Amino acid sequence: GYSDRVQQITLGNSTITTQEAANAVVCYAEWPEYLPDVDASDVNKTSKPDTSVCRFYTLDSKTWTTGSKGWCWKLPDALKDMGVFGQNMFFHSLGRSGYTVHVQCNATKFHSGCLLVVVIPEHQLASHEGGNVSVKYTFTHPGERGIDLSSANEVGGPVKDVLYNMNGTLLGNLLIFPHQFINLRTNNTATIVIPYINSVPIDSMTRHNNVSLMVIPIAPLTVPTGATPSLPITVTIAPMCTEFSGIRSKSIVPQ
Amino acid sequence: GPALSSAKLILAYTPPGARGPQDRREAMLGTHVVWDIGLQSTIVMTIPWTSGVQFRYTD
Amino acid sequence: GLPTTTLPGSGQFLTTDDRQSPSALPNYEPTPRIHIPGKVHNLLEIIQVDTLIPMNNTHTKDEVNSYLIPLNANRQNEQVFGTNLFIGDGVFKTTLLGEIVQYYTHWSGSLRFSLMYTGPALSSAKLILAYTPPGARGPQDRREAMLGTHVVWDIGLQSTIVMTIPWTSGVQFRYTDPDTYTSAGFLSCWYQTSLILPPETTGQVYLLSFISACPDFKLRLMKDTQTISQTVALTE
Amino acid sequence: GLPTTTLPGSGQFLTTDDRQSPSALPNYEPTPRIHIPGKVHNLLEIIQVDTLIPMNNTHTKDEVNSYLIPLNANRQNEQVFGTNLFIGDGVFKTTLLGEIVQYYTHWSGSLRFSLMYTGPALSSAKLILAYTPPGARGPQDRREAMLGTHVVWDIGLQSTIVMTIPWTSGVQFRYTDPDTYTSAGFLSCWYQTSLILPPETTGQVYLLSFISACPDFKLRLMKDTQTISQTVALTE
Amino acid sequence: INYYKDAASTSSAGQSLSMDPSKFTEPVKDLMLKGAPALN
Amino acid sequence: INYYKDAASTSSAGQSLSMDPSKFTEPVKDLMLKGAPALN
Amino acid sequence: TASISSGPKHTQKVPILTANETGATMPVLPSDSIETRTTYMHFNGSETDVECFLGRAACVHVTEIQNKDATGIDNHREAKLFNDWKINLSSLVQLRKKLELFTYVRFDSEYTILATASQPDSANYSSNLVVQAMYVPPGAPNPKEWDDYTWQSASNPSVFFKVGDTSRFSVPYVGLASAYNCFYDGYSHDDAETQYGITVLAHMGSMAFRIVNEHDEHKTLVKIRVYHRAKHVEAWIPRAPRALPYTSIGRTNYPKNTEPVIKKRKGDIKSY
Known part of the structure; x- marks a missing residue:
């Protein structure tokens, strides 16, 4: 009775359930993993906060309306302020991470x-x-x-x-x-x-974003008659296998 | 709710030490479950025992 | 001293030849490779990923809307869209498939054309997609269309339909730049029964359409793409 | 006569190529080698010997005094010296390490920075040396400094302290000529408690500071040094 | 025959003959079988 | 293959791959162990 | 090894119905939806290997220098008495679009340099000039006059060839990281005004050209063309091809009021 359709992701102290999924994609067919020694360069032992950083942060919600063009978030930026993930980020010289991204938008069978x-x-x-x-x-x-x-x-x-x-x-x-x-x-x-x-084993988390997540309406939203013409879209993202290295004073970044 | 409706709720448990959360951002940083309303009608959240002291008072 | 004779072609520079050269940096040690997901080995690997076709080309400036094929409720017997199959031109031309095909002179193989339906879940529809092999005109009505390669698509839970344009050809390669002798046919789509919207619903629904190549596919004789040019060298 | 074809590059002279040549002096017998202590095989052998850093660069003409870092008795909390780590420039530049690094384009590896104390034997002091990895500013007070790589040095019988700047880096090579993306951090030093002189004693005491490379070190892609030039050929 | 000492100086590489589109065409977490329903 | 008779006419030598900094970094008469006190 | 034989089907097993929302491209074949006959491939896909695709010489740079009396020239560089070039593969667009089909790329380079001379105004003859091309890595002294100590090039690889001829040598992959970034969504540091996108991660050195000959009575224009061939190619993460025109080395920027890149139909959606 398992369907491709229902799923549960538990990561840290947070869990997500979807009853209407369409499988899940794993980029380039590879699952996040830590940095192997054979690939390492910096000699510093890294810090792996584990469950305190590898949990699900839900960003603030967007509103899809008939005029929406699309939204774009950058990683790790979007999380620069979430809990201890963010602190670690500003406090180490280098860090590395994979993520689980879960974008949510429900409507009805008339939309x-x-x-x-x-x-x-x-x-x-x-x-x-x-x-x-x-x-x-x-x-x-x-x-x-x-x-x-x-x-x-x-x-x-x-x-x-x-x-x-x-x-x-x-x-x-x-x-x-x-x-x-x-x-x-x-x-x-x-x-x-x-x-x-x-292209490097570990990098700076503040001067370089390594992915942009993009949500773009392509077939315009069409609500049932006399329905409110909009739906919220929510993005929840969880760092996974995060490692930080080169701890010190705490970066100060523009603006 | 009617079967043809839909909803996504977040339930959050905030362990002792912080105030009752004031907005979801605050709430989502502690124990939470995104619930997707579907065919399966109920969602079971567990408040896992988070505690220094191994017993609490019922009063 | 060993006696030699030099042949015609000595001293020429052929941009396509492959020989050894002295290294300018003797003994230099390159940075170690680390692992990076995503390695590509053949362009044939990537042209099998499907991408959207701006089928609705009828606009006047590029817009998200030329990716949307509209559907009308309650029309019967009528035609949804039509296109020839010059994969190197026209709708196909900006797609990844179209875009790569243009780096080669000849192509052969099967194409996979799929349509994903986006209408409300409580609606229903039956469409016919038809491939017309070279030699006849683009079909003018479903009767004409239905006598060639076709699939009746029933819109359901399963949202997409994958039509294959099987390689139908005398000559085993066609030109990617449109050519007559070498032409591949037409693709059309018609209402089989008709789109029906549920109550409380209205307007147009759209289909998204993709194109990718079957594992069948061959591309050969590399050349330069008409898709990019320039008038002065760029600078920083 | 064997048929040949000559390729592009024929007749060129590449100063870095390595081939055979006829000897102008056929059959000549070179002088026998005798043994001489001191043979060098790799420049990597010599950049591990430490040499003094003119850290006290603040003078106006080169003087023995820019090798001396002064220390003041009874100051608390304060800062002894600061420098960035562009090993190819600034204080580092005239040191043997700095001087060799400049023959190469890229470097990677750990550095060893040591301080030898020269104050009277009956004095005492505790200093903190801190390495700040790329990404933060040069520390402005010990609190800031102490949160990064640091060593509390206790001045004793053992006169020198060896601090290592461990290789902290995303990219596995940095440029020897100063570059931002590629920058390596800062090095600062502060009183941990304070220098205390014995009775009958007075004034400033100095630290000597050295730099050498760890066995870790890599240098690659040789080039010409900005450290030497000329306007006419010399003569005898 | 390489006439030169360094690897950069050798001619072009030889065909991967690797070819595996699945990292691009089927990066799904739960395996999809052709013929079985897409969504169960 | 050397085409020439004399040794001077051969190409560059090949890497020492010798490497021993101790004649320069530790020319002390009584051996110093890292970790043991410098002056006893 | 192209199609197997397949006949009528009346099943409960429908390979042509899928859900594209999943992100997969299901491997459907002609034989899943029509009746086919056996046929063989007769083909390997040899010429679509990335080594082949990026492995032919492309013109990457055209510069020019002249041989003339430098007497009284206050700025050799400015008189084209000599000229440098910081190596790039993104200034002439043909090769650039090809490389930017990938995000990270790693390869050795083989350079061919063709030099031809022109004598646009009255000369008795064509002189024979030798060009010197010096590879100047970042941090080396840069030439100031056309005959500086720099040209001694005692530690810097340089090639001397004749105008009309070609020079050819190959440089190992000189990138600082494991691959060259074709794209970089970062800065060199968290500065508020530092440049975006352009990075050392791409840096391949730089090259200075000059004529070794002193001047004859006439002037001679020498125009240098640098060709680049990738050998030992490795490419990761395919991306969408470039659609709009390019404006700058190293930024993704396209020109304003550009033209529609998708050809408008002459007719309906229904048109053939």
Whole structure:
């Protein structure tokens, strides 16, 4: 009586149940694991807070309306302030982590709409100015708020044009990245497990984000007659196999 | 609720030492379960024994 | 001193030749490799992942909406969409498949075309997808369409339908840049019965459509893509 | 006559290639080698010998005094010296380590920083040395400093203390010429308790400081040093 | 025959002949069998 | 393959792979053990 | 080894109905939905190997230097008496789009340098010039005049070849990390104004060119073309191909008021 459909994920002191899942994706078919010695470089023993950092943090909720263009969060940024995960983050020189991402959106059998939930490794954004204008730090570190693709261009911020993925590629091809759809008629959640993907064994958690999670409405939300025209979307994310190394004074970052 | 409705609730247990949570952000950092309302009608949350002292007073 | 003779071609530089060269950095030790998920070995590995087709090309500036094929409730007998199968041009051209095919001169193989339905769960519909092999015109009505490769799709719990355009061909390779002799057919879709919405519901519903290549597929003779060009060198 | 084809690069002179050549002096017999103590095989052998760092760089013309870090009696909580760790520049630059690092583009490894105390034997002191890994600012007070790599040094019979800056890094190589992304941290030193001089004694005492590389160390991709140049050829 | 000492100086590599699209085409956690229902 | 008769005409030598810093880093007459006191 | 024979089907086992919401592309074949006959592949997929795809020489840079009397020139660099180039693979777009199909890439480089001379104004003859190309790693003294001590290049690899000829040598993978980042969503430090995206993670050195010859009576323009061929390629994490035009080395930025990249139908959705 197991269905692909019902699932339970327990991680730390927190549990999620979905009764309307559509399997789960594990990026590149690899599950998060700690850093092996053969791959290690820094000689420091690392710190593995385990259950105090590897639990589920639910970010603040978004509201899908007929005019929504899509939202974008960066990792580990989105979690920069969650509990002890965040403290560890500002206090060590280097850290490394994988995540379980669970995006939630329920409706009824009269609604229609379909969101794309995708994880993009190394999502370098484009400046809407063109040329070689850079995208300032603050703009690519929105924190739990994430970036709202239907917000206005700002100065020093990225471009927010959806048919171009914020980088000069077409929305249609985002499907080459680990992703899952939430089609109100099928699905009510999306779950993706992200292994740590980098060109170095461990890195800085503040100067470099290693994935952007993106939720994009593709088939517009259509509510039943005289229904309220909107649904909330909630994102809950859990660091998994986290390791921190090179402890010290506590980083100070712009803004 | 009617069978054709849907809902997602979070239940949170806050262990001794902090105040009753004031918003979900605060609540979600302690013992919690996201409940997805479905065919299976009930959700069973456990308040695991979190304690220094091994017995508490009933009063 | 050993006697030699040099042949025609001596001193030429052929950008495609593969020979040994002296290393400028004798004895240098590269950084160790660490493990990174995701290694690609063949472009054939990636063109099997499906991506969305902007089938609804009828707009005037690129929009999220050209990915949506609309469906109308209560129409009978009528046609949902049509396209030829020049995978290197037209709707296909910006898709990952289209985009890679363009790095090669010839392609052969089967294509997989699937449609995912997004209408309310309490609605229902039966569509027919038809592949018309080279030699006939794009079908003009379902009767015409239904006499070639087709699948009646019944919209249900299972949200997507995967149609295969089996390789139908005299010549074993076709050109990726559109060519007549080498042309592959048409793909059309019609109401088999009709879309029906539940009460309290209204308007258009949309289908999303994807394209990817079957394991069947072959691409050969690499060349340059018409999809990118430039007028002055870029700088930092 | 055997048929050949010559490739691109024929006739070039690459200063780094290694091939055979005819000897101009056929059959000549070189002088026998005799034994000489001191043979060097790797530059890695010599960068492990420690040499003095002109830490006290604050003078205006080079002087023996910039090798001396002064210490003041009776100060509490305060800071003895500070420096970033760009081994290819600044204090490090003229040291043997600094001087060799400059022949290579990349370095990786642990550094050994030691301090030898020279104050009267009847004095005493406790200092803290702190290494701050990349990512934070140079510490501004001991509290800040003590939260990173540190050693409380107790001045005793044993005159020197050897602090190691363990390799703390994401990227496995850093640039020897100072670069941000690639930067290595800061090194600071503060009074842990304070220097105390015996009676009949007065003034400043000094620490000498050395730097050498741990056996850990790697240097790669040789290049030319900014440390030497010229405007006309020399003559006899 | 390599005429040169360093590995960078050798010619092009030889075909992976590796080929495994499943990391890209089927990264699902619970295995899907073709023919069995997608969602149970 | 050497094509030439004299030894000077051969290519560069090959890595010492000798490496022993102790003549430079520890030329002391009585052996010092790390961990034992420097001066007894 | 392409299609097996398959006949009529009337089953309860439907391989063509799937749920794309799952993120998988189910491996459906012609034989799951029509009746097929056996056929063999006759093909291996050799020429789509990434080593093959990135393994041919591409032009990566065209520069130019001239041989002329430097007498009274206050700025050789500025007179093109000599010229440097910080190596890149993202300035001419053909090879760039190919590499950016991947996120991280690792390979050895083989460079070919073609140099041809031009004599746009009245010369009695064509002189024969020798070019010197010096590889200048970050931290080395940089040439200031066309005949500085720098050109001694006692520790820095340099090649001397003749104009009209070609020079060829190969450099090992010089990246600092395990792979070169084709993309980097980071900064060099948490600065509020530091540059975004451009990184040393990509840095491949830099190269300085000059003519060794002193000047003749006429002037001679020498134009340098650098070609780059990847050998021993390793690529990870495929990405969506580049759709809009490029504007800058190292940023993803596209131009404003660009044109629709998807071709509009001449007709209906229903059109053929």
